[PDB]
Amino acid sequence: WNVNPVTLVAASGDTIKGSAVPVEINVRFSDLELVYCAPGRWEYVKNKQI
Amino acid sequence: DKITSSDISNVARKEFLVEVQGQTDFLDVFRGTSYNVNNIRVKHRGNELY
Judged by CB atoms closer than 8 Å, whether chains meet at A45 and B1 is answered as yes
- With contacts defined as CB-CB under 8 Å, which chain B residues touch A44? 2
Among B1, B3, B4, the residue with its CB nearest the CB of A43 is B1
Q: Cα(A37)–Cα(B1) distance, rounded to whole angstroms?
A: 11
Data resolution in angstroms: 6.8
Q: Which residues of B3-34 are buried (b: 16+ CB within 10 A; e: fewer)?
A: eeeeeeeeeeeeeeeeeeeeeeeeeeeeeeee
Compute the nearest-CA separation of A34 from chain B (Å).
9
> What was the experiment behind these coordinates?
cryo-EM
Q: What angle do CA A23, A26, A30 make, to 5 degrees?
A: 90
Beta carbons of A36 and A14 less than 8 angstroms apart: yes
Please list, in sequence order, all residues whose beta carbon lies within 8 angstroms of the beta carbon of residue A46, skipping any fewer than 6 positions away.
B2, B3, B4
SS3 assignment, position B48: coil
Q: Cα(A24)–Cα(A8) distance, rounded to whole angstroms?
A: 6
Measured between CA atoms, the residue of chain A closest to residue B4 is: A46
- With contacts defined as CB-CB under 8 Å, which chain A residues touch B4? 46
Please list, in sequence order, all residues whose beta carbon lies within 8 angstroms of the beta carbon of residue B28, skipping any fewer than 6 positions away.
none
Q: Cα(A11)–Cα(A18) distance, rounded to whole angstroms?
A: 13
Please list, in sequence order, all residues whose beta carbon lies within 8 angstroms of the beta carbon of residue A12, skipping any fewer than 6 positions away.
A20
